[PDB]
Amino acid sequence: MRILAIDTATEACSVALWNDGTVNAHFELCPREHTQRILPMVQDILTTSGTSLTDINALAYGRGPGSFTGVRIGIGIAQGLALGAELPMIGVSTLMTMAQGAWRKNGATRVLAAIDARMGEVYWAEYQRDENGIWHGEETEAVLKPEIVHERMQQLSGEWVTVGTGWQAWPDLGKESGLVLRDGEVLLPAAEDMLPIACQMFAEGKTVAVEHAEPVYLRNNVAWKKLPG
Amino acid sequence: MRVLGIETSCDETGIAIYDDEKGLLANQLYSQVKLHADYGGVVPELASRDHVRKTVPLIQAALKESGLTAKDIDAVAYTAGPGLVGALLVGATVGRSLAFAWDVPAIPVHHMEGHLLAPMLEDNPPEFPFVALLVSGGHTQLISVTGIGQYELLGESIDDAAGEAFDKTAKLLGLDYPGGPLLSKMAAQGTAGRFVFPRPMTDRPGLDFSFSGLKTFAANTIRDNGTDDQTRADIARAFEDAVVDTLMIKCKRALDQTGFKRLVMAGGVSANRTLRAKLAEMMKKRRGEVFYARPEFCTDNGAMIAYAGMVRFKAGATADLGVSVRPRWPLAELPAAHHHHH
Numbered sequence: 001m002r003i004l005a006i007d008t009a010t011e012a013c014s015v016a017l018w019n020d021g022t023v024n025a026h027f028e029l030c031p032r033e034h035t036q037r038i039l040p041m042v043q044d045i046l047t048t049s050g051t052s053l054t055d056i057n058a059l060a061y062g063r064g065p066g067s068f069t070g071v072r073i074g075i076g077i078a079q080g081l082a083l084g085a086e087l088p089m090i091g092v093s094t095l096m097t098m099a100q101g102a103w104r105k106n107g108a109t110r111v112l113a114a115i116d117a118r119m120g121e122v123y124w125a126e127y128q129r130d131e132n133g134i135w136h137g138e139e140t141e142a143v144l145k146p147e148i149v150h151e152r153m154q155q156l157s158g159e160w161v162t163v164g165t166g167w168q169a170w171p172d173l174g175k176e177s178g179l180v181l182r183d184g185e186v187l188l189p190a191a192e193d194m195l196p197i198a199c200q201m202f203a204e205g206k207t208v209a210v211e212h213a214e215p216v217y218l219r220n221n222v223a224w225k226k227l228p229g
Numbered sequence: 230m231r232v233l234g235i236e237t238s239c240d241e242t243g244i245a246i247y248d249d250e251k252g253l254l255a256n257q258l259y260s261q262v263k264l265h266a267d268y269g270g271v272v273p274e275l276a277s278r279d280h281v282r283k284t285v286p287l288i289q290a291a292l293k294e295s296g297l298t299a300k301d302i303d304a305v306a307y308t309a310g311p312g313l314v315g316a317l318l319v320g321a322t323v324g325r326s327l328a329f330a331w332d333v334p335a336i337p338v339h340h341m342e343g344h345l346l347a348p349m350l351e352d353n354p355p356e357f358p359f360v361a362l363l364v365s366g367g368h369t370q371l372i373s374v375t376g377i378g379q380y381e382l383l384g385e386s387i388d389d390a391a392g393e394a395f396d397k398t399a400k401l402l403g404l405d406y407p408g409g410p411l412l413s414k415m416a417a418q419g420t421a422g423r424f425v426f427p428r429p430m431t432d433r434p435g436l437d438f439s440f441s442g443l444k445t446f447a448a449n450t451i452r453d454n455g456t457d458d459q460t461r462a463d464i465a466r467a468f469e470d471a472v473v474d475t476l477m478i479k480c481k482r483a484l485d486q487t488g489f490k491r492l493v494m495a496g497g498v499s500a501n502r503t504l505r506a507k508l509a510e511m512m513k514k515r516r517g518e519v520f521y522a523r524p525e526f527c528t529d530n531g532a533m534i535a536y537a538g539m540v541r542f543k544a545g546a547t548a549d550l551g552v553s554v555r556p557r558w559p560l561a562e563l564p565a566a567h568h569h570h571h
């Protein structure tokens with residue numbers, strides 16, 4: 001097994017539960033309403049699936065990147081629930097969640113994920129699924145300017161599927177890349193797509209205690225210039 | 230009854246456990262001084278980031294310190310505001326979901342009410358009615374307190390809070406952020422009356438404050454005088470004496486206008502030794518009493534939140550599953566409630 005997944009990193013608010021064989025999922029667009037909707041959503045899915053927080057084996061959470069506030073709501077709720085019910089935590093990439101979503105919808109195995117990071121940048125990732133369902137490319141996650149995304153695309157080849165709000169913000173992002181680009185039909189991460197990544201992570205003992213849960217912001221130059229000297 | 234209180238309104242993570250019979254069972258604190266010192270102020274984004282790192286281990290340390298388990302906690306209380314929206318949301322999201330998982334009521338708490346009630350954590354707590362001088366980094370207010378949630382605003386700052394004013398002048402004196410307590414130590418090494426700063430808004434009657442004009446007077450005194458340690462200490466003392474005399478004169482007027490024989494001083498600036506001494510001095514002459522928290526409960530802490538949490542829980546201030554924060558929240562908006570302190 002039993003894994004509860006939570007995500008609030010983007011405009012979406014989603015909850016999913018893997019009851020071992022069974023998937024109960026709830027996805028919704030929550031602009032300006034994440035803090036009002038996430039706990040009733042967690043309670044509904046626990047009611048629906050007939051599972052209790054104590055009977056959950058792990059708490060999967062949207063570690064980021066995305067909105068700073070949104071990433072924190074996710075980790076904040078997840079930390080509170082994991083501390084309260086004594087559960088291990090699994091930090092799942094929102095760029096990898098979308099990679100998984102594209103595979104679920106149309107079998108995409110080669111995903112170029114792009115989230116609008118604001119400030120003219122995108123949170124970028126190049127994800128490639130192997131024969132055993134493992135997404136390779138976690139090391140390619142970076143906050144990039146469109147020109148640097150173009151450079152990254154010059155070092156790649158073949159057919160790729162585009163996923164996320166960065167392609168919506170920059171529709172000409174893959175212009176003259178030399179790649180074959182198709183729409184992945186995934187704009188936002190869904191907690192339902194975190195579950196298979198998290199099942200794999202739990203099995204491999206890649207779970208942390210609540211005090212070790214960490215967000216992935218990618219953008220760390222968030223402060224005004226330091227004082228002289 | 231036991232309440233776990235969570236404080237994350239600014240740049241300090243405060244966690245405490247309060248027993249209505251036994252008193253305070255735990256008190257944990259993490260100050261983000263080193264993080265914000267480099268920038269000369271609180272960077273909200275960095276503050277929210279540190280709150281995520283520190284909230285859960287400080288909850289863990291407070292349960293270890295008290296020897297308490299989940300089942301011993303009756304309610305979870307968190308600062309819902311006022312403060313920085315990003316900082317506030319960390320304590321409130323962790324607090325609300327912890328309360329849910331622990332299956333206990335959740336109590337959103339007003340940060341200024343926590344400060345107001347911090348003298349109740351010491352022996353001989355004040356009885357109602359009293360005048361409260363709430364003097365921190367964000368606020369400078371005079372309140373006529375006739376009960377819990379019966380807070381009449383008598384006066385407030387028209388510009389800078391006494392906290393900001395102490396911090397802004399200390400920056401001019403070369404001191405690191407926050408400079409309020411460092412300016413105080415520097416002031417103790419100064420000559421009384423070497424320089425004379427004005428006591429703003431004490432010429433005409435009224436209970437409102439102004440401290441911006443004091444920064445200007447400090448910068449003009451720094452520029453026009455000697456760079457040495459001694460001249461800087463005299464500047465610091467004339468600044469500190471001007472603030473304390475102004476806060477005392479306004480308190481006198483508030484007590485004379487209300488007819489009250491009790492003065493409560495709280496908020497970060499109420500940790501100031503010259504102010505504690507001058508207000509105690511004034512109350513003895515008036516044949517009244519002064520009430521203050523231990524210096525560590527003057528600045529942002531979790532003890533004041535678990536206490537106000539206990540008060541608001543008995544009053545009935547319980548939250549539904551929604552998580553909501555208020556960066557601006559008036560003390561006047563809080564509902565009237567009974568005080569069950571025994």
Ligand SMILES: C[C@@H](O)[C@H](NC(=O)CP(=O)(O)OC[C@H]1O[C@@H](n2cnc3c(N)ncnc32)[C@H](O)[C@@H]1O)C(=O)O
Nearest residue numbers: 238239312365366367368392409497498500501528529
């Ligand atoms: C989050 C908001 O709601 C906000 N919170 C704060 O402002 C943090 P505080 O701990 O309540 O007060 C900090 C202020 O108190 C000052 N301070 C602290 N000790 C001293 C000292 N001995 N002498 C002089 N000043 C001192 C210090 O310079 C600083 O400006 C609020 O309460 O409105």
Ligand SMILES: Nc1ncnc2c1ncn2[C@@H]1O[C@H](COP(=O)(O)O)[C@@H](O)[C@H]1O
Nearest residue numbers: 031032033034035067068069070314554
């Ligand atoms: N004051 C707040 N109270 C509750 N939720 C908030 C607040 N500020 C931001 N959020 C949530 O965080 C999301 C992302 O924030 P932003 O980074 O400003 O786009 C918003 O869409 C809201 O759901």
Ligand code: NA
Nearest residue numbers: 046052053054
């Ligand atoms: Na349950």
Ligand code: NA
Nearest residue numbers: 230231250301
């Ligand atoms: Na008991």
Ligand code: NI
Nearest residue numbers: 040549550551
């Ligand atoms: Ni509800």
Ligand code: NI
Nearest residue numbers: 376566567568
């Ligand atoms: Ni009463």
Ligand SMILES: [Zn+2]
Nearest residue numbers: 365497528529
């Ligand atoms: Zn405060």
